[PDB]
Design a protein around this ligand. Structure first.
Ligand SMILES: Nc1ccc2ccc(CNC(=O)c3ccc4c(c3)c3c(n4CCO)CCCC3)cc2n1
Ligand SMILES: CSC[C@H]1O[C@@H](n2cnc3c(N)ncnc32)[C@H](O)[C@@H]1O
Lengths: 625, 307
């Protein structure tokens, strides 16, 4: 369901308040630790010596409640970034006191406001807190979408509101957030909560808030419309925003007082649940991917490492792929052998990288549908796969299928064949060394034969995500170059991110390649326009393939296959984030380099600013031959 | 006597009526229960001893402020976001609740009434300012001129359409409820610091004073050149004029001292009787030399100023 809480600034008695909040169906309560008006003086005599307890004790709630049900808040009078020195000194002391108390209590989260540009001291105090001692509390920053000064009305005779378009005025809040997090070095303990008013921004700078660590949203009761039956409802634009937020599983907090007291306060939750229960259901892709959002994995390298049975089991659970292969074969056979030669003509097909043989079965089915006679050779190197093939041959396939245990680049086939079928594509199409394997195994193709796939390509696009940036930063190892984590690709289900531009093609291959001196090395330059002031964190790619004349597979978001799910996009990070201004373009260069033992990629950004070459020589990442 | 056994530790407000009786406001700002009370004394020197109170009740929440409405009404600014009205009964024994509305989305920080006797205004930490109808128990209007916590409002003693306000945005406004654009910005001849309190001059309808966060006060002419003087080592947080043909200005501050100034802002009297923040002060109408203060040290102090 949808988690939610209540925001109160007046809690006379915690036992009763907590009870009532729970009664209405809320999961948690946000509240101050210290009475908010109870200013505490430090330094100055006699005020600093004021006697008595400073707040309520912690013996009122069980430990379980403290660390589960309560979110803390900074008192409103604390202002570390004020101009008067005396205020600043008391404010810093006050902030530390409150944070330490919350730590004592074990609170899971605490809220700090941001309402202006200069938050330098706020950041200084918070980071000193973060790095001192040992704590697990999460810090959320409260940032409005629209700065309050632009939400004021125009009722002042000599102080009119701005009535023109100051473009940057729509970006003030984002900037405040951005500066705060860089001061605090993108700590993973710092995240945001957004406060939604009645006035929404254009579709942009909505999108720019994605790829940001949003944990919660704040909805005041003041933005509900009243319907014909007297119940609070949302406008259509607000509903659209909520549906988007539901995908990130943010928590919702309801604030303000009850403007519909006659309908019971809890009715606001009922409305919110109604909308979530009417969101459209997930498809198979989404269900399959549940639990892997923004999770990084190293790519597989089957040429070098033998895969275990479970990997194969997973690869096979995606029937759309096999159906497309079967169609490709079916058409190919029909296009080569006429009906008149049907019973006197036997075609020879070879499967390279047979695995557990799902393609063998697909091949046999295609031949049956096509009513054409075939012979098959299944070739695999992985001995732990060969062993299953032996059983298949014996138990069902019979003599029509020959099983060969060898490296396809070394094996001498006894016969030439006219159709070669393979499944060597990886997530970026050529990162499996598929063209090397196939070029080797080209000499046994008949000169008038065909390769399935015949063609494949690859695509790249710039992306932004601060969350992913940290996930990469986190993947450090001892006795390794400390930066060698930004120089290797990752397989990932990208979810909480923003796409900066359309994808563009990068490297392309085809088979059989009849050119002399083919050269599988590549160089490519790409350039993309940018329509938002955002920060580049890395590039991501996709691929497309042609199995046959009219048969293709794709994972490009725009042409993505209808229910194909075994594949995930590839991520290529850069070491430093790059700020890009609207109207500029991003120019990126890629290389595909090789030698007699290894293959590796190198990449860099040349514009708007230059960056370092990532992974030169394959020092951090290689693909073994 | 139909009152709680114990008064809360912090005293936050005090005001006199023309018959010499006083009203105190109190709250618990620390401890297990966070709520306050209202108390009435007819013997000023007996305060704060509960045993000699004439009346008093507990409230459901803390009390941010409170003022007199005519002779019997008590208008209260609550922490709950509520605006509420209490009334003294015929025997000045019980305090009766008349109404309670919840119109603010945050703590009500200030409340005051206007010279017509039927209108009132309030401010809150929520940036919204509201105008109330005291007879109908409704909100007549609301405005969002400020983009910061409202810190002070005040009604003009001479005009029932007029009030002042300020907030932590360093803007000071003058309001006129009869205009299409009710607010007008005063501006400032000495900008740069946030104002903390406002008060109207008792005789001159176009004159008012304010204090700031640095302990400085200033006297200004609404139509335009200002007069100022530093007084306190800390934020002023409170100003009131004496009931004299030649008024004197009392000034409170967070430095816990009390001062009385001349019209020239010269210091005439100073006291350090308090041991904690001082929250308010009021003049006794029956004794022009007597100033009474209230604060967080739980003392009630009677000062005689050598006027
Ligand atoms: N020649 C072919 C044929 C089919 C393919 C299907 C997809 C892809 C892209 N995916 C990867 O590279 C990749 C990385 C890490 C992975 C997996 C997959 C899986 C697991 N892990 C975590 C570590 O073991 C855990 C167990 C289940 C699967 C490449 C293909 N290449
Ligand atoms: C369909 S999973 C990919 C298959 O390619 C096979 N493969 C990769 N490289 C070779 C090779 N050089 N010779 C034979 N099979 C290979 C792997 O063993 C795996 O079964």
């Amino acid at each position: 369901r949808v988690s939610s809480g209540r925001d109160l600034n007046c809690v006379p008695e915690i036992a009763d308040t907590l009870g009532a909040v729970a009664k209405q169906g809320f999961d948690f309560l946000c509240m101050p630790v210290f009475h908010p008006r109870f200013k505490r003086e430090f330094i100055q005599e006699p005020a600093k010596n004021r006697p008595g307890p400073q707040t309520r004790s912690d013996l009122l709630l069980s430990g379980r409640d403290w660390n589960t049900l309560i979110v803390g808040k900074l008192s409103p009078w604390i202002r570390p970034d004020s101009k008067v020195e005396k205020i600043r000194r008391n404010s810093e002391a006050a902030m530390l006191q409150e944070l330490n108390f919350g730590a004592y209590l074990g609170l899971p989260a605490f809220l700090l406001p941001l309402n202006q540009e200069d938050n330098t001291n706020l950041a200084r105090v918070l980071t000193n807190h973060i790095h001192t001692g040992h704590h697990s509390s999460m810090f959320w920053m409260r940032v409005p979408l629209v700065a309050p000064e632009d939400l004021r009305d125009d009722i002042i005779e000599n102080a009119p509101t701005t009535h023109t378009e100051e473009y940057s005025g729509e970006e003030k809040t984002w900037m405040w957030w951005h500066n705060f997090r860089t001061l605090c070095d993108y700590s993973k303990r710092i995240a945001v909560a957004l406060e939604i008013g009645a006035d929404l921004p254009s579709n942009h700078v909505i999108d720019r808030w994605l790829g940001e660590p949003i944990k919660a949203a704040i909805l005041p009761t003041s933005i509900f419309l009243t319907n014909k039956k007297g119940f609070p409802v949302l406008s259509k634009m607000h509903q659209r925003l909520i549906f988007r937020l539901l995908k990130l599983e943010v928590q919702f907090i309801i604030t303000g007082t009850n403007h519909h007291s006659e309908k019971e306060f809890c009715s606001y939750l009922q409305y919110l649940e109604y909308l979530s229960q009417n969101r459209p259901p997930p498809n198979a892709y989404e269900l399959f991917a549940k639990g892997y959002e923004d999770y990084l994995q190293s790519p597989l390298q089957p040429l070098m490492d033998n895969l275990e049975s479970q990997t194969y089991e997973v690869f096979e659970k995606d029937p759309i792929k096999y159906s497309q292969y079967q169609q490709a074969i079916y058409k190919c056979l029909l296009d080569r052998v006429p009906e008149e030669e049907k019973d006197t003509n036997v075609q020879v097909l070879m499967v390279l990288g047979a695995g557990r043989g799902p393609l063998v079965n697909a091949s046999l089915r295609a031949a049956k549908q096509a009513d054409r006679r075939i012979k098959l050779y299944a070739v695999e190197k992985n001995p732990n796969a060969v062993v299953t093939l032996e059983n298949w041959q014996f138990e069902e396939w019979g003599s029509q299928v020959t099983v060969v245990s060898s490296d396809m680049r070394e094996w001498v086939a006894p016969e030439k064949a006219d159709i070669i079928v393979s499944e060597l594509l990886g997530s970026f199409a050529d990162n499996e060394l598929s063209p090397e394997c196939l070029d080797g195994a080209q000499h046994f193709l008949k000169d008038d034969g065909v390769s399935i796939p015949g063609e494949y390509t690859s695509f790249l696009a710039p992306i932004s995500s601060s969350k992913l940036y940290n996930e990469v930063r986190a993947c450090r190892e001892k006795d390794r170059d400390p930066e060698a984590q930004f120089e290797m690709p990752y397989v990932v289900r990208l979810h909480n991110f923003h796409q900066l531009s359309a994808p563009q093609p990068c490297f392309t291959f085809s088979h059989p390649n009849r050119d002399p001196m083919i050269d599988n090395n590549r160089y490519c330059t790409l350039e993309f326009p940018v329509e938002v002031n955002t920060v580049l964190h890395g590039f991501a790619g996709y691929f497309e393939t042609v199995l046959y004349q009219d048969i293709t597979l794709s994972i490009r978001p725009e042409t993505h296959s209808p229910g194909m799910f075994s594949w995930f996009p590839i991520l290529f990070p850069i070491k430093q984030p790059i700020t890009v201004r609207e109207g500029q373009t991003i120019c990126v260069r890629f290389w595909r380099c090789s030698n007699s033992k290894k293959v590796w990629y190198e990449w860099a950004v040349t514009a708007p600013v230059c960056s370092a070459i990532h992974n030169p020589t394959g020092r951090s990442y290689t693909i073994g031959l | 006597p139909n009152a709680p056994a114990c008064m809360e530790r912090q005293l936050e407000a005090a005001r006199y009526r023309s018959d010499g009786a006083l009203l105190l406001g109190a709250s618990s700002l620390s401890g297990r229960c966070w709520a306050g009370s209202l108390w009435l004394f007819k013997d000023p020197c007996a305060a704060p001893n509960e045993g000699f109170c004439s009346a008093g009740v507990q409230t459901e929440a803390g009390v941010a402020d409170l003022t007199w409405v005519g002779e019997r009404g008590i208008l209260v600014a609550s922490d709950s976001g509520a605006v509420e009205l209490w009334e003294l009964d015929e025997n000045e024994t019980l305090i009766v609740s008349k109404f309670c509305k919840y119109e603010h989305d945050d703590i009500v920080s200030t409340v005051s009434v206007l010279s017509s006797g039927t209108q009132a205004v309030s401010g809150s930490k929520d940036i919204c300012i509201k105008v109330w109808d005291l007879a109908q128990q409704v909100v007549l209007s609301s405005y969002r001129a400020h983009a910061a916590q409202v810190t002070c409002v005040a009604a003009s003693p001479h005009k029932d359409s007029v009030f002042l306000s300020c907030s932590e945005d360093n803007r000071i406004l003058l309001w006129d409820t009869r205009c299409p654009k009710p607010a007008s910005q005063i501006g400032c001849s000495a900008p740069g610091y946030l104002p903390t309190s406002l008060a109207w001059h008792p005789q001159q309808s176009e004159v008012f004073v304010f204090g700031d966060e640095n302990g400085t006060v200033s006297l200004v002419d609404t139509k335009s050149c200002v007069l100022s003087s530093a007084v306190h080592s800390q934020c002023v947080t409170g100003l009131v004029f004496s009931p004299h043909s030649v008024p004197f200005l009392a000034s409170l501050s967070e430095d816990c001292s009390l001062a009385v100034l001349d019209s020239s802002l010269s210091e005439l009297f100073r006291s350090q009787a308090h041991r904690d923040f001082v929250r308010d002060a009021t003049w006794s109408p029956l004794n022009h030399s007597l100033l009474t203060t209230v604060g967080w040290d739980h003392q009630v102090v009677h000062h005689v100023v050598p006027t």
